[PDB]
């Protein structure tokens, strides 16, 4: 008697590597601590005093930032309820583009809430119900406690001011040059029509200077080089082709027959009269600028370099069809002279060494157009990259502002705000709901809490002193991270505000990805291959 | 290359960055286990074997060090706890502060010999200030300086909270303990007191015993458990059958003494035990052993008889029962007697059931007070925990009754000297002036790791700390800033000498002159070659 | 039973992980510390490979160690960037960098919190950055002698840490000539560095034209003429030689008059170029592409000199050099698209032969031929001027000087030290902490140099008190100096973007509160 057996059944059964859990204890409250390790794992990065974090990757590259979606991606989630967590969290950097750490964080709690309801004596099922109904009651809390809206996207000053909140959690320090910065891009590429696309602003990251050397590109920048003599033009005619800047061939073989001596003393000769007309063409349509996607031919190069043609050579396929929108020109497949439509122009196309790095800038003067770019200067690839992070996330506030102007206040003020209406929710509602719908109110509580600890402060002064104005009857008031004491103030009056949308899919999302782990009762893990 | 030595050789720079990077190992270790606020830490021996403590020099004796600049931390700590019994962590911490300080000097091209000079020149200034500014008498302040030393001694330890009633207890027992001898100078002699531990009934339920107790339980079960009018007999030899030594044979010629002979051997141990008992004395304890043959006799006798009792037990029993040890029955008379003024007596001696085991408590012992204690917690790493402040306590409260000066905690005394120091490095020189104010700075490690610890804001209450010390300092009508250190329950200064929260100067004297003997010895290092073992 | 991230995970947090972060950057910075200055010292890095390196440039140096701590990768990164945007400083980066960090190690390790510090060390980055700006000296008279004189000494200061600081007036003065003889644009590309082993420092030289290495000549070459007096010189992008006239190309005759008709057709193909280049008068041939052995004897035959397989960069200097435009094709050979130079000539040069392009004066490049005992020497050399040349260029553009030796940390700290003394008390410890860390460079200066950088870090805190903000270490003396009047010249965006970049780096490193490393 010095050795238990397997039991008959799925236990002998199961394959050698492979695992089985099953019950509250090996399934669900295992895949609770997990979802709760990750949710460590990004705290202390959430909120403007929130601290990056320094990711080496299996390809030993390395990231230095505060974003969860990041962090999370460049992690090697391998328990499946984190990786379900992560899912969630991604689907809101898709949805919305910021609040992963905000769907971490509150699934998380959710989560934490939802072990210790089942120790007490509630079943999945029933916090899953009541988990449920007070999402929906959040979702018809949030319109109520919307305190202002956009009211203009067109200026500069008020887009700036609305930008600044996503884009100081990331990037504390300097975020009115940022929020500028993003503002005049985004209100740059901004149509008279209501569509906003992200990928027409444009971010070039040159290694040089620093974050306050940053500035905004009414146009394009490629780090490259021309190919011909020519480096800058004043009254850009641009001309832009898919096809490469050499004679047209077969797409079957083709074969030079010669049979006489006058052909082939001919050929070579006939090719660049050929190429010189294709040219000449091109320059006498009034080009002076051509930008191929394909490869350069020499005769061609010499004949462009004749008729004071600039040329560039993109090689991407993205990077010609922005270029395309950027100057109003049509890709043509063929070598042909383009018509007055078909033309491009910019008020200067030119070559500048920005830093070590050299440039080729189709920049318009006036201050629209179809694309914008962003030319970031730092001292460090990393801090580059972060900052290009925070664009992003500046970008997609911006869109989700043209989606829905609609904005409650941050620094945990709507958080708070719906932990009070929803716990005095559940104190209405009878039956074993209640626990569930208490506990998805106090989940709230975690989004304060982790601002205060970052902040610097205890988190359960700063709570209890949140409750107590919002029960005096204050909704805007969050917490002030200028206080080295627990402090609060009037988030509106600060200019501290989220995005109505933002907060929606993020509390959707968290509240989906915890009910789906609380739904999980057995897990069958394959040998890891 | 040129130097054919077979071994490493570091040189320069390197290795006084290596020396004080182990010293700073060591003390980072540590730092976590200062103060009211500090933590415990596990410890495991390779086997599974837990030792749970706060102690630094318990944790320094404990970890398995491989460098020899912080072997002297370890020996530094070990040697704090020698001379002194409290400050084994703060001697550890200020230590390597003076490395670290000491060594950025050197960075900075100050002369080591200039540096020595200097902290040199700032420990005995330190000292000379403690003595005549910082001391507070145990006289001026009465018993409740001995309960707030034992108090302050027992914050950071596991009988903390308890302290209010440690603290008693420890106090009780240095009294009792106390003896004065020839030369009528008042001696507290500490580890007289003995410490057992059982686990079981919660701290609070730790007892103090007006008298003795012993891990020792009776020889035989016939034996009674209890006595009142104890007449104690102490012994240092063996009670057996007796054997002749080793140059003594007996050869038999003649069978008809072979009888005689054997039943002498036993009639021999028969006769010592019978002179023993004839003159009153119901209980017996023996270094040595007690053969069953024996056993019955104290049986017969009604006796309580104790065997391989230990040596100091047994001098400590004696001492408090006024009886005689005796490692043999012989008077200069070349007869062997036992007298009954060689007893000592007790009003009580009985085998009391500790948890589920047994010892005996020799209650109530003339011609002399003793003490023991018996600790009660929940298993046995508790227990020792418990020891291991409790003894840090007794020492504690032994030096505040033999030197009658205390020093104000929570730091109040190294803002003081961090003050003074910086003021007065003014006048010598100016390296070594560079260097006493290092020294200075070194000192307000101990606030810093004090508030770190209670998690708050170091740099703001250290500086709330060196400003009222500074006015102190500075104007003639508040010297009582002096008094002034951390609450760190609070996170705000306040008067220590008002809230207790007391040090034998000793400590911090000591304190210092081993850091500062510890931090020149590592600094005075150069180079190092490191031979390859055989 | 499952655990959250893979097996082999490695996570460092909290306060030891931050002053493990320090304490890597102390060493990076430690790496170069010994190269700042002119009493600098040279470092030899080794590869797997066993070819040496051997520079005093920090940049170089820290992309040669194979650093691979994620905290310590930024000194070398800031160091990079250092070098692109200014092209000097990246020593001077660094060990503010690791000076910041230092200095707020000890409150880092007492639980300042890092946004603190992060905010002081951008209020003393701005307040320092602006005081530049502001006490910068700008000689507003826009004279080409006192330009040229201000451009020489900003190289001779550049050029004051190397292995040619012995013939530093010569290099600058050179270095002065080739970016003022540059284009609007000041690309690299068009100055020329040729390193020919075999030679003195003194014997390098900048020629006022180009030069290049010969190339790969045929049979003929040698009965070809190596001097001409006023040639026209055709650039051409050009193959010239017997060849397939294409690689798709076929022939298919029935008749050996037609084969004879093909043979003798590629001959007057090849024969027609040739004739071409001869008429339009030049009597200097290069091209990007090969000459072969028939065209090197034909233009032997005609005393013409010609180079095939010239690499692209140097027929581009060749070009904006002598005046010409680079052919593809041969059948439009103009005066407009001839180049022409007053001399060429081929000539010896320490084993190598070189072709010469001398004597013109509508000449956009330049081409510096430096000669030394080594190849890491001339190696160290083309390093030294390019530090030299980028300093010249930046001045160029913008002659705003500060003084050197130490001299403006020394005026900032104590600018710092002055405004720390006016704030509340949290943020008055951090930015008198960025005060005392910038003078690490006046430090370090006495430190290479071998004086008590103590004594004279007290001279320089009480001159700078007492009115004088360009006193810092005189060197050859052991003392201090007026180094504006010693003419230790700097270009303000030295220090600008040096204490831009170390203050990035050091509130990027003092951000990061934990380290994840994944396994491979
Ligand atoms: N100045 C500020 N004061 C208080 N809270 C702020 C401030 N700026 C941003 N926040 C809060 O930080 C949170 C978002 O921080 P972030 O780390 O970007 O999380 P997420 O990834 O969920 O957007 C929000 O609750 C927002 O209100
Ligand atoms: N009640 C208290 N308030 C503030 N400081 C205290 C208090 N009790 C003890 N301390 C301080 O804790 C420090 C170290 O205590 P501890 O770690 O227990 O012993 P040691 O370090 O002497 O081995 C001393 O400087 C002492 O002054
Ligand atoms: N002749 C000189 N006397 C004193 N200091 C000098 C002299 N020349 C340069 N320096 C100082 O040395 C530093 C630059 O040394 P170097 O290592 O060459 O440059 P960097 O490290 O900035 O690339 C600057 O502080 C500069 O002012
Ligand atoms: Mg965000
Ligand atoms: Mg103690
Ligand atoms: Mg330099």
Redesign the interface.
């Known amino acids: 008697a010095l050795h238990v057996p397997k039991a008959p059944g799925f236990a002998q059964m199961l394959k050698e590597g492979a695992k089985h859990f099953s019950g509250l204890e090996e399934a669900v409250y295992r895949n609770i601590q997990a979802c709760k390790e990750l949710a460590q794992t990004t705290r202390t990065a959430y909120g403007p005093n929130g601290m990056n974090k320094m990711v080496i990757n299996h390809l030993e590259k390395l990231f230095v930032t505060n974003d969860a979606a990041t962090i999370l991606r460049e992690l090697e989630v391998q328990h499946p309820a984190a990786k379900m967590i992560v899912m969630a969290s991604h689907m809101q950097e898709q949805e919305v583009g910021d609040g992963t750490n905000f769907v971490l964080v509150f699934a998380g709690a959710l989560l934490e809430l939802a072990e210790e309801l089942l120790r007490i004596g509630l079943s999945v099922s029933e916090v899953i119900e009541g988990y449920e109904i007070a999402c929906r009651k959040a979702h018809e809390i949030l319109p109520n406690l919307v305190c202002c809206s956009a009211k203009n996207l067109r200026d500069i000053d008020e887009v700036s001011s609305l930008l600044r909140t996503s884009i100081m959690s990331k990037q504390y320090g300097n975020e009115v040059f940022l929020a500028k910065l993003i503002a005049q891009a985004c209100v740059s590429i901004f149509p008279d029509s209501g569509h906003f696309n992200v990928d027409n602003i444009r971010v070039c990251k040159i290694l040089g200077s620093g974050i306050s050397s940053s500035s905004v590109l009414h146009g394009m920048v490629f780090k490259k080089e021309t190919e011909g003599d020519v480096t800058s033009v004043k009254d850009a005619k641009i001309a832009v082709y898919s096809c490469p800047f050499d004679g047209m061939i077969t797409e079957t073989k083709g074969t030079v027959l010669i049979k006489t001596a006058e052909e082939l003393m001919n050929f070579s000769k006939g090719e660049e009269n050929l190429m010189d007309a294709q040219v000449k063409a091109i320059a006498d349509t009034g080009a002076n600028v051509v930008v191929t996607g394909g490869k350069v031919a020499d005769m061609a190069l010499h004949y462009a370099n004749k008729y004071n043609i600039m040329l560039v050579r993109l090689n991407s396929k993205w990077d010609l069809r922005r270029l395309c929108k950027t100057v109003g020109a049509t890709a043509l497949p063929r070598l042909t002279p383009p018509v007055l439509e078909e033309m491009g122009h910019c008020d200067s196309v030119y070559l500048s060494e920005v830093g070590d790095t050299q440039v080729v800038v189709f920049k318009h003067e006036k201050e629209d157009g179809a694309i914008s770019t962003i030319v970031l200067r730092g001292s460090t690839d990393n801090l580059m990259d972060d900052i290009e992070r925070a664009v992003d996330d500046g970008v997609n506030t911006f869109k989700v502002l043209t989606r829905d102007k609609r904005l409650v206040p941050g620094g945990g003020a709507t958080e708070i705000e719906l932990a009070k209406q929803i716990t005095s929710y559940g104190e209405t509602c009878p039956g074993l709901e209640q626990y569930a719908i208490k506990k998805f109110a106090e989940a709230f509580e975690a989004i304060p809490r982790a601002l205060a600890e970052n902040s610097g402060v205890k988190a359960n002064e700063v709570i209890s002193k949140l409750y107590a104005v919002h029960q005096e009857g204050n909704k805007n008031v969050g917490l002030d991270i200028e206080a080295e004491v627990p402090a609060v103030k009037d988030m509106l009056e600060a200019g501290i505000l989220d995005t109505y949308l933002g907060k929606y899919w993020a509390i959707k999302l968290a509240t989906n990805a915890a009910v789906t782990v609380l739904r999980v009762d057995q897990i069958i893990m394959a040998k890891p291959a | 290359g040129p130097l054919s030595v077979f071994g490493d050789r570091s040189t320069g720079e390197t290795i006084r960055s290596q020396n004080v990077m182990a010293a700073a190992s060591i003390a980072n270790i540590v730092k976590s286990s200062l103060g009211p606020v500090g933590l415990d830490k596990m410890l495991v021996d390779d086997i599974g074997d837990v030792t749970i403590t706060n102690d630094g020099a318990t944790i320094l004796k404990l970890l398995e060090v491989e460098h020899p600049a912080a072997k002297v931390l370890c020996e530094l700590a070990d040697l704090q706890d020698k001379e002194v019994g409290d400050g084994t962590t703060s001697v550890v911490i200020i230590a390597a502060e003076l490395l670290k300080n000491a060594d950025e000097l050197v960075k900075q091209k100050i002369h080591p010999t200039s540096v020595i000079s200097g902290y040199r020149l700032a420990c005995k200034e330190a000292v000379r200030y403690i003595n005549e500014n910082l001391i507070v008498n145990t006289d001026e302040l009465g018993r409740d300086c001995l309960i707030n030393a034992a108090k302050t001694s027992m914050s950071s330890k596991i009988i903390g909270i308890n302290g209010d009633f440690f603290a008693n207890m420890v106090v009780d027992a240095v009294l009792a303990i106390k003896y004065t001898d020839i030369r009528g100078q008042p001696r507290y002699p500490v580890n007289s007191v003995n410490i057992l531990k059982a686990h079981g009934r919660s701290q609070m339920e730790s007892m103090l015993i007006s008298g003795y107790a012993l891990n020792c339980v009776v020889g035989s079960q016939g034996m009674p458990k209890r006595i009142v009018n104890a007449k104690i007999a102490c012994l240092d030899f063996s009670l057996q059958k007796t054997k002749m030594k080793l140059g003594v044979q007996v050869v038999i010629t003649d069978p008809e003494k072979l009888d005689q002979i054997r039943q002498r051997e036993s009639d021999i141990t028969k006769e010592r035990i019978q002179k023993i008992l004839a003159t009153g004395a119901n209980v017996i304890l023996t270094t040595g052993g007690i053969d069953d043959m024996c056993l019955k006799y104290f049986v017969e006798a009604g006796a309580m008889a104790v065997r391989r009792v230990l040596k100091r037990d047994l001098k400590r029993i004696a001492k408090a029962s006024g009886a005689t040890i005796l490692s043999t029955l012989a008077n200069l008379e070349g007869e062997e007697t036992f007298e009954a003024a060689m007893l000592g007596q007790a009003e009580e001696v009985v085998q009391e059931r500790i948890c589920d085991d047994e010892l005996i408590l020799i209650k109530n012992t003339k011609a002399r007070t003793s003490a023991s204690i018996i600790l009660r917690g929940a298993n046995d790493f508790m227990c020792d925990e418990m020891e291991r402040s409790l003894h840090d306590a007794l020492c504690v409260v032994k030096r505040v009754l033999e030197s009658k000066s205390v020093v104000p905690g929570g730091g109040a005394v190294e803002a003081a000297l961090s003050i003074y120091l910086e003021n007065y490095a003014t006048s010598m020189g100016s390296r070594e002036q560079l260097a006493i104010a290092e020294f200075a700075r070194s000192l307000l490690v101990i606030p810093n790791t004090l508030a770190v610890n209670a998690a708050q804001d170091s740099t703001d209450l250290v500086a709330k700390l060196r400003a009222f010390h500074n006015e102190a300092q500075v104007n003639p009508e508040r010297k009582n800033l002096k008094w002034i250190g951390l609450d760190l329950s609070n996170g705000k200064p306040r008067d220590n000498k008002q809230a207790g929260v007391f040090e034998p100067t000793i400590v911090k004297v000591k304190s210092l002159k081993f850091a500062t003997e510890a931090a020149i010895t590592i600094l005075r290092i150069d180079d190092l070659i490191k031979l390859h073992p055989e | 039973?499952?655990?959250?991230?893979?097996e082999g995970?490695d996570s460092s947090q909290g306060i030891?992980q931050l002053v493990s972060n320090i304490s890597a950057c102390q060493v990076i910075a430690e790496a170069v510390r010994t190269t700042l200055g002119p009493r600098g010292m040279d470092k030899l890095i080794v590869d797997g490979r066993g070819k040496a390196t051997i520079s005093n440039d920090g940049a170089t140096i820290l992309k040669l160690l194979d650093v691979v701590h994620?905290?310590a990768?930024?000194l070398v990164?800031?160091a990079?960037?250092?070098?692109?945007?200014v092209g000097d400083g990246t020593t001077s980066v660094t060990l503010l960098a690791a000076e910041f960090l230092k200095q707020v190690k000890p409150?880092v390790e007492?639980?300042?919190?890092?946004?603190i510090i992060?905010?002081a060390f951008?209020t003393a980055t701005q307040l320092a950055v602006n005081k530049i700006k502001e006490i910068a000296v700008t000689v507003k008279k826009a004279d080409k002698v006192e330009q040229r004189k201000l451009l020489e000494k900003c190289a001779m200061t550049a050029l004051s840490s190397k292995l040619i600081s012995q013939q530093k007036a010569f290099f600058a003065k050179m270095v002065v000539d080739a970016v003022m003889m540059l284009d609007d644009?000041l690309?690299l590309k068009m100055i020329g560095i040729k390193k020919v082993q075999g030679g003195a420092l003194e014997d390098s030289q900048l020629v006022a034209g180009v030069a290049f290495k010969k190339t790969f000549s045929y049979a003929g070459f040698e009965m070809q003429p190596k001097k001409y007096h006023n040639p026209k010189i055709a650039l051409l992008?050009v193959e010239l030689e017997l060849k397939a006239?294409?690689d798709?190309?076929?022939?298919?005759?029935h008749t050996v008059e037609?084969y004879q008709?093909?043979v003798?057709?590629?001959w007057?193909?090849l024969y027609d170029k040739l004739e071409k280049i001869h008429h339009s008068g030049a009597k200097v041939v290069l091209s990007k592409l090969p000459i072969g052995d028939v065209a090197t004897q034909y233009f032997a035959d005609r005393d013409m000199f010609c180079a095939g397989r010239v690499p692209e960069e140097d027929l581009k200097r060749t070009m904006m050099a002598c005046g010409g435009?680079?052919?593809?094709?041969v059948?439009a050979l103009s005066a407009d698209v001839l180049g022409r130079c007053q001399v060429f000539e081929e000539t010896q040069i320490g084993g190598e032969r070189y072709n010469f392009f001398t004597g013109c004066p509508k000449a956009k490049t330049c081409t510096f031929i430096l000669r030394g005992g080594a190849e890491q020497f001339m190696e160290e050399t083309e390093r030294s001027l390019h530090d030299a040349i980028m300093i010249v260029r930046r001045a160029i553009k913008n002659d705003s000087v500060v003084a050197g030796g130490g001299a403006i940390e020394m005026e900032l700290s104590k600018y710092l030290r002055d405004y720390s003394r006016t704030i509340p008390?949290?943020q008055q410890?951090l930015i008198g902490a960025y005060a005392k860390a910038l003078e690490i460079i006046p430090?370090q200066l006495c430190?290479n140099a071998g004086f008590?950088?103590?004594n004279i870090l007290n001279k320089l805190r009480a001159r700078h008190a007492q009115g004088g903000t360009w006193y810092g270490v005189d060197i050859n003396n052991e003392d201090i100096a007026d180094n504006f009047e010693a003419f230790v010249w700097e270009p303000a965006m030295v220090r600008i973007?040096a204490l831009?970049?170390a203050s990035?780096?050091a509130?990027?490193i003092v951000?990061?509160?934990?380290?994840?490393?994944?396994?491979?």
């Open positions: 039973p499952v655990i959250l991230l893979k995970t030891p994620p905290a990768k930024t990164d800031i990079k960037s250092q070098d692109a945007e409150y007492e639980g300042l919190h890092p946004q992060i905010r951008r644009l690309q992008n006239e294409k798709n190309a076929e022939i298919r005759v037609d008709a093909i003798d057709a590629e007057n193909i435009s680079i052919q593809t094709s059948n008390g949290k410890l430090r430190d008590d950088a103590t973007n831009t970049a990035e780096a509130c990027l951000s990061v509160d934990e380290t994840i490393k994944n396994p491979r």
